[PDB]
Design a binder for this molecule. Structure first.
Ligand SMILES: O=C(O)c1ccc2c(c1)nc(Nc1cccc(Cl)c1)c1ccncc12
Length: 324
């Protein structure tokens, strides 16, 4: 398997674009930042609201815990500089003694998605998904997969109507035929390729994750596919897409399933998208939304829309018009 778009981007841009092992960071002055308030903690980071003291301006300091992965995240954030709806890198600093690095990013006025998403209109969903598609089409066009696309990593200032894709700590460069680690993404947003241990994945992983997110929004069910473990996650997906399309996909990519799917995985017919429509979510539902969702949520990553193809979908016509 090789990506159907942007496969040769890292080839064309060469070693100085993707070789993060040999990154030399020009560290900023740590005493130029003051930390004010912790805003959050991750598996990999603490995040604090802070001040850039020379300018007295609001910013974020992300303190990070292998060295390899710090360099990857920094090199990606430098390469993505200037890109639409990508979180802006302000600096990289570290402790004088301990050498613990921190990434300094722009501050965003987020509304938590459990609160924000239900307040959305149909146009709002169309608009923010379109804004997210600009960020993903940008990073894919630069040889980079995000690999952790989920609502926590999409920051929305609903007053400014502005969007930022954050947390590039799982992101990687795409190299044709590379076998990538499948333990990426949070469980609810993992593509089938991660769940059957198909390692030769590409940018199209982000598009499955986008699909899950989009299903949450239009069907008002967070998360859409609610599995308990990685095994059950594939069962929840199979109970919607069906097992017929699953077996053709496995056959097509020569994937053999783990032995202990045979007890838990039954034969399920395809549930139509229409069966998820209710009184409460009908506000979001149109024939264009379902068709768009259908073209993102495919077993076969090579059948999913590209971010670019997705921007031309009729679903986004109210948004292209409103921008003229
Ligand atoms: O990782 C980044 O690149 C990254 C970049 C920017 C923010 C962030 C993470 N996390 C934020 N908040 C947050 C909220 C809950 C949990 C956690 Cl760990 C963090 C946040 C807030 C305000 N503006 C920018 C950010």
């Amino acid at each position: 398997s090789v990506a159907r778009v942007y496969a040769n981007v890292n080839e064309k841009l060469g070693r100085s674009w993707w070789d993060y092992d040999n990154l030399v960071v020009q560290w900023g002055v740590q005493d130029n930042y003051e930390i004010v308030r912790k805003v959050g903690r991750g598996k990999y980071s603490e995040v604090f609201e802070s001040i850039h003291l020379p300018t007295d301006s609001k910013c974020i300091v992300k303190v990070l815990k292998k060295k390899k992965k710090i360099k990857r995240e920094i090199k990606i954030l430098q390469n993505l500089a200037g890109g639409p709806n990508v979180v802006g890198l302000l600096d990289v600093v570290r402790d004088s003694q301990s050498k613990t690095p921190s990434i300094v990013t722009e501050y965003v006025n987020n509304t938590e998605f459990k609160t924000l998403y239900p307040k959305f209109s149909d146009f709002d969903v169309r608009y923010y998904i379109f804004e997210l598609l600009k960020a993903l089409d940008f990073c894919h066009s630069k040889g980079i997969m995000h690999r952790d696309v989920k609502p926590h990593n999409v920051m929305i200032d609903h007053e400014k109507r502005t969007l930022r894709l954050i947390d590039w700590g799982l992101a990687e460069f795409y190299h044709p035929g590379t076998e990538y680690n499948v333990r990426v993404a949070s469980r609810y947003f993992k593509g089938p390729e991660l769940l059957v241990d198909f390692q030769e994945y590409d940018y199209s992983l982000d598009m499955w994750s986008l699909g899950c997110m989009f299903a949450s929004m239009i069907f008002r069910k967070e998360p859409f596919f609610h599995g308990h473990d990685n095994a059950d996650q594939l069962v929840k997906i199979a109970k919607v897409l069906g097992t017929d399309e699953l077996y053709t996909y496995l056959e097509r990519y020569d994937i053999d399933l783990d032995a202990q799917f045979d007890d838990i995985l039954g034969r399920y017919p395809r549930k139509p998208w229409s069966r998820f429509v209710s009184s409460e979510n009908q506000r979001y539902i149109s024939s264009e939304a379902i068709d768009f969702l259908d073209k993102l949520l495919r077993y076969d990553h090579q059948e999913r829309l590209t971010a670019e193809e997705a921007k031309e979908h009729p679903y986004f016509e109210p948004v292209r018009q409103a921008a003229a």
